[PDB]
Symmetry: C2
Subunit: 273 residues, 2 copies
């Protein structure tokens, strides 16, 4: 198969590949998996496939997230159209075990608008300055659904949501479980560091607050650096496969009210360390 990188940092298009064939061809699937680990996000055009095949392909990466939600083919979630996805985020990092990744297919949509972007948070970590790496090495931070999705709810619904999903603490520097690469693991869901206030970092109060929040802002803003980014334009039956552990994504909301239909299959991830 042909692998065509979109940028030097992240993303590649797979050509001459029918995702349906990877369900039963173990060699083809192995290569796709190898490419996903190297390029963080893989793109394909003209994937005329069935929902069972979409589900069965994603299942090759691991068990699928099967919370009922708002989407006939278990594992598949329909997304028919919200200003929450237009933010640099790693999917559901507010969970104890955020997902491994996702296989996303565009069913129908407008001819222009609605691009999706990804950022390489392995590169974002690797290029940090030495004194930032030393400073953040043992930091941990909390990721909150309360303060993002719950923020606009009636206070009782917000607090119930929080009880259902307590703010998850994760290492700020995450070790990718399959490659060993270090990942800068704070994003739009991250509210604050939990273990910043130490004698090594804090002489006086203003070192802790706003100091801790200023460092967090610097870290989450690394995803906004174009050097780490790729931007993908959707067409009918286009597919994105991405490694949610190593990336953040941003669904661009440049379009007026319109009908866009996507279908995704999320893959279960493990505890970040």
């Amino acid at each position: 198969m042909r692998v065509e990188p979109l940028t030097c940092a992240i993303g590649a298009e797979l050509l001459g590949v029918n995702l349906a064939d990877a369900v039963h061809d173990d060699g083809l699937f192995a290569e796709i998996r190898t490419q996903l680990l190297r390029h963080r996000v893989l793109f394909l055009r003209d994937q005329d496939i069935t929902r069972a095949e979409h589900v069965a392909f994603a299942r090759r990466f691991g068990e699928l997230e099967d919370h009922p939600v708002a989407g006939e083919h278990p594992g598949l979630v329909r997304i028919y159209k919200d200003r929450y996805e237009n933010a640099w985020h790693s999917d559901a990092s507010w969970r104890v075990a955020p997902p491994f990744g996702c296989v996303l297919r565009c069913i129908d949509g407008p001819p222009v608008g609605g691009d999706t972007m990804w950022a390489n948070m392995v590169l974002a970590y690797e290029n940090l300055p030495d004194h930032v790496k030393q400073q953040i090495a043992d930091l941990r931070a909390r990721h909150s659904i309360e303060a993002s999705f719950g923020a606009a709810m009636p206070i009782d619904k917000r607090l119930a949501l929080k009880a259902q999903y307590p703010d998850a603490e994760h290492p700020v520097v995450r070790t990718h479980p399959e490659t060993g690469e270090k990942v800068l693991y704070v994003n739009a869901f991250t509210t604050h560091f939990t273990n910043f206030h130490t004698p090594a970092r804090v002489r006086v109060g203003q070192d802790a607050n706003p100091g801790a929040g200023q460092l967090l802002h610097y870290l989450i803003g690394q995803a906004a650096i174009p050097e780490y980014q790729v931007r993908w334009r959707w067409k009918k039956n286009s597919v994105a496969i991405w490694d949610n552990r190593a990336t953040q994504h941003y669904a661009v909301m440049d379009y007026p009210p319109c009908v866009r239909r996507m279908e995704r299959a999320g893959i279960v991830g493990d505890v970040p360390f």
Copy 2:
């Protein structure tokens, strides 16, 4: 001609269009001009042209910046990987540019533009009120001059004193308001008024915090387009309404571009 926008905010590809022909077809150039003003930046593939044709097309927008083929500058291969409006540090920054890729690597080196008219219009009302009369300085000393020997930096500053420009710029051909601060902008010159400043921290870091919020608007993906170069691909953009960013994701390699810059006037 076929105009294919790349995003809902900015950028469009022109198809079935040869720029060389636009020198003499007045109707065609009018359309190209109209589309540029509407879409901020225009992209074309497979522009097999000579340097004479490149310059003559660009002169249709106005006189060329002339700091073998006058007006054209060859660029053969870390300041351009920043959100900036070209030469906003000048008293009269350029109108725009016609940029052609000669040859280059198959991956890497994308260029991005941001729509700073949209960046202004979506600001919150209280920010629009606060910045309406602001002016700010754009410095070559503090960017290009910064790493030079101190003597060369000051001489460079002497040639181009830090230019003051309105923070809210009126586009001269569309009447649109443009958020006109970028990476070259150092600080506001007229922020410290009794309406904005009660106590010292309101002015400093207060003024600097507002400037950072403004220049950071260019980093919003909603306002952006990203272009991947091919041989003989061409970009034309309105430098008054946009900022651009040359992505520097590539390892050391050889890339060859040619550009024709168009003189702009005083921002007001």
